[PDB]
Amino acid sequence: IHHHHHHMKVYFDDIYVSTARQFELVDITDQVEQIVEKSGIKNGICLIFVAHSTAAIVANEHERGLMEDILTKIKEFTEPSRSWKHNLIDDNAHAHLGATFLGAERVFPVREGKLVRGTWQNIFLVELDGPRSERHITVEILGE
């Protein structure tokens, strides 16, 4: 269809991650960026979303010490060793709590063809209940 008016483009792609540890941060920034480039959309938004209740999406600086701090703080906050009521059923209440607070998604601007983000703003999958063989991240670009 040869459009003649500005119109909404929506482009989807998917990133899969296998996680090795119970708590893990996995940098997905370059994969998200490649999908933004692949979309051909110049101006819009990029939604990065996990359909998982024991993982999350965050954005911060890729420095190995900090990554350890992030996971240490998440662990302290969620209390994996606590007798949460959900642990009667499962053993991952802490993971659900972390994900609930952190959120399943982050939204970035896409501008003049580029993901808008800081020099030290990388995108991470936050695993709180690994190892998992398949964490699925949806990447959606929406715009012109």
For residue 144, the partner it binds in K ion, Cl ion, a second copy, none, with Cβ less than 5 to 8 A by kind, is a second copy
Q: Is-contact 19 135, C-beta < 8 A? A: yes
Dihedral in degrees, nearest 10, Cα atoms 58, 56, 111, 9: 180
Dihedral in degrees, nearest 10, Cα atoms 53, 54, 59, 61: 180
Q: Which 65-84 residues touch K ion, going by CB under 5 A?
A: none
Q: Which of 13, 22, 53, 75 binds a second copy (CB under 8 A)?
A: 53
Query: To the nearest whole angstrom, how small is the minimum distance from the Cβ of residue 124 to a second copy?
Result: 9
Q: Which residues of 92-127 are buried (b: 16+ CB within 10 A; e: fewer)?
A: bbbbbbbbeebebebebebeeeebebeeeebbbbbb
Q: Does 91 bind K ion (CB under 5 A)?
A: no
Alpha helices in 63-103 (DSSP H): 64-78, 93-102
Q: Which 99-128 residues touch a second copy, going by CB under 8 A?
A: 99-109, 111, 116-118, 120-121
The binding site for Cl ion (CB under 5 A) comprises 5-6
Q: Does 29 bind a second copy (CB under 8 A)?
A: no
What residue ranges bind a second copy (CB under 8 A)?
5-10, 12, 43-45, 47, 49-53, 58-61, 63-66, 68-70, 73, 77-78, 84-89, 93, 96-97, 99-109, 111, 116-118, 120-121, 138, 140, 142-144
What residue ranges bind K ion (CB under 5 A)?
90, 92
